Amino acid sequence: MQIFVKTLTGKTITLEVEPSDTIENVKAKIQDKEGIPPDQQRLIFAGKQLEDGRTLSDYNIQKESTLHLVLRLRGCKXX
Amino acid sequence: XXXXXYX
Ligand SMILES: *[C@@H]1O[C@H](C(=O)O)[C@@H](O)[C@H](O)[C@H]1NC(=O)CCCCCCCCC(C)C
Ligand SMILES: *O[C@H]1O[C@H](CO)[C@@H](O)[C@H](O)[C@@H]1O
């Protein structure tokens, strides 16, 4: 099925996915298209942040559904 | 370590 991933940068990414795919898969696909490493990706749907490991069907994500992408990297150089 | 960051 088809779903959309939107950012507030004015970008919409179209993806072809299966209801059984995990949020991880989705991030991997996004990496292919946009070059953003999955660890740097946060996906939001229906007021919830989506967890790597759960499936699109778990979250009731269906065709034409729109997930929202936001980027998150905390500084890790130091100690 | 003992000093923070992030750099
Ligand atoms: C400090 O950063 C370490 C790292 O390598 O990222 C972590 O492994 C370690 O757990 C982190 N320490 C804490 O999260 C609690 C730190 C309390 C002291 C710092 C408080 C916030 C301001 C500093 C300068 C970040
Ligand atoms: O952030 C770490 O590297 C820096 C290099 O300039 C140091 O100034 C800092 O004290 C830490 O060692």
Side-chain angles (χ1 to χ4, degrees):
Chain A
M1 62 187 186
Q2 177 171 276
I3 62 160
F4 306 114
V5 177
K6 198 190 86 177
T7 77
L8 294 188
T9 81
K11 177 135 56 181
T12 299
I13 298 170
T14 303
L15 303 177
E16 303 294 329
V17 305
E18 299 289 16
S20 59
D21 290 335
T22 72
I23 297 306
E24 303 173 342
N25 204 340
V26 172
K27 287 181 177 178
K29 298 173 184 287
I30 293 171
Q31 176 175 30
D32 293 331
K33 299 272 175 50
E34 289 298 326
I36 305 159
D39 48 285
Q40 290 175 30
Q41 300 180 207
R42 300 306 183 279
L43 290 167
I44 308 306
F45 180 74
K48 271 192 174 186
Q49 175 175 308
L50 310 181
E51 312 168 28
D52 302 354
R54 299 185 66 180
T55 68
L56 274 44
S57 58
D58 290 342
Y59 288 107
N60 190 67
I61 296 167
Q62 302 169 349
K63 71 156 191 180
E64 314 277 70
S65 287
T66 297
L67 289 42
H68 289 85
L69 170 57
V70 74
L71 300 181
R72 171 81 155 162
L73 188 45
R74 303 179 72 210
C76 49
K77 283 282 197 63
Chain B
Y6 300 86

